C-alpha cells in the first residue's frame, strides 16, 4: 500500500511510461528533460493531483514530500531511457529484490553489496539521490524494474533517523528474500 506520495508517483510514472511506450512525443521530452535536470520544471512532475490528497501535514515535510516525488522521477527518467522492450516501473519490485538480481542467487557480489549498504547511510537527500543514480544505472543495464512509488514512499520516509533504519531494513530484508 502506498501513502499519499508514492500514490501520486506511481500514477504520474504510468503516464509517463505508457506515453514513452507510444513513442509520444511529449513522454519523450519529459523523460530527457528529467535527466538533464538531475542533480540541480515542477509543472511537469508535480501537478494538483499531488497536492490535493495530502494530509496535514509538520513544518518542511511538503518540501521533502516534493523533493522525493522529484528524484523518484528523475531516477526513473535515467531508467527507462532506451529501454524499448520492457517497464522499468512494476509495482511490487522493492530495491533489495531488484539490486539482489544483479548478482547470482547463489553468490554476493561484495563491493556491489558494500556500495548498496552505503546508500541508506546518506546523510543528505542530493547524496542519496546520487547513490541511487549508479543502483539504478546498474539495474537498467541489467533491464529489472523497480517501484517507484514504493520508492517515493521510502525517500519521504527517509526524513526521520527512525524512518531511515525502517527503509534500510526493508531493502536489507528484500536483498536476502
Request: no cysteine.
Given at each position: 500500500?502506498?501513502?499519499?506520495?508514492?500514490t501520486?508517483?506511481?500514477?504520474?510514472?504510468?503516464?509517463?511510461?505508457?506515453?514513452?511506450?507510444?513513442?509520444?512525443?511529449?513522454?519523450?521530452?519529459?523523460?530527457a528533460?528529467?535527466?538533464?535536470?538531475?542533480?540541480?520544471?515542477?509543472?511537469?512532475i508535480?501537478?494538483?493531483?499531488?497536492?490535493?490528497?495530502?494530509?496535514?501535514?509538520?513544518?518542511?515535510?511538503?518540501?521533502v514530500?516534493?523533493?522525493?516525488?522529484?528524484?523518484?522521477?528523475?531516477l526513473?527518467?535515467?531508467?527507462?531511457?532506451?529501454?524499448?522492450?520492457?517497464?522499468?516501473?512494476?509495482?511490487?519490485w522493492?530495491l533489495?529484490?531488484?539490486?539482489?538480481?544483479?548478482?547470482?542467487?547463489?553468490?554476493?557480489?561484495?563491493?556491489?553489496?558494500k556500495?548498496?549498504?552505503?546508500?541508506?547511510?546518506?546523510?543528505?537527500?542530493?547524496?542519496?539521490?546520487?547513490?541511487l543514480r549508479?543502483?539504478?544505472?546498474?539495474?537498467?543495464?541489467?533491464a529489472?524494474?523497480?517501484?517507484?512509488?514504493?520508492?517515493?514512499?521510502?525517500?519521504?520516509?527517509?526524513?526521520?533517523p527512525?524512518?531511515?533504519q525502517?527503509?534500510?531494513?526493508?531493502?536489507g530484508?528484500?536483498?536476502?528474500a
Amino acid at each position: 500500500s502506498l501513502t499519499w506520495v508514492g500514490t501520486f508517483v506511481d500514477q504520474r510514472v504510468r503516464e509517463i511510461q505508457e506515453g514513452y511506450r507510444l513513442d509520444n512525443p511529449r513522454a519523450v521530452a519529459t523523460l530527457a528533460r528529467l535527466r538533464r535536470g538531475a542533480g540541480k520544471l515542477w509543472g511537469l512532475i508535480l501537478d494538483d493531483r499531488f497536492y490535493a490528497d495530502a494530509p496535514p501535514l509538520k513544518e518542511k515535510d511538503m518540501e521533502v514530500a516534493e523533493n522525493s516525488a522529484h528524484i523518484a522521477l528523475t531516477l526513473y527518467a535515467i531508467h527507462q531511457q532506451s529501454r524499448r522492450d520492457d517497464r522499468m516501473h512494476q509495482r511490487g519490485w522493492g530495491l533489495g529484490e531488484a539490486v539482489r538480481r544483479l548478482m547470482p542467487s547463489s553468490e554476493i557480489d561484495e563491493p556491489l553489496r558494500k556500495r548498496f549498504v552505503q546508500v541508506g547511510h546518506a546523510v543528505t537527500y542530493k547524496a542519496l539521490a546520487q547513490r541511487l543514480r549508479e543502483i539504478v544505472t546498474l539495474l537498467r543495464r541489467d533491464a529489472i524494474p523497480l517501484d517507484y512509488g514504493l520508492l517515493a514512499d521510502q525517500l519521504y520516509q527517509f526524513r526521520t533517523p527512525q524512518g531511515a533504519q525502517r527503509v534500510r531494513t526493508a531493502w536489507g530484508r528484500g536483498f536476502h528474500a
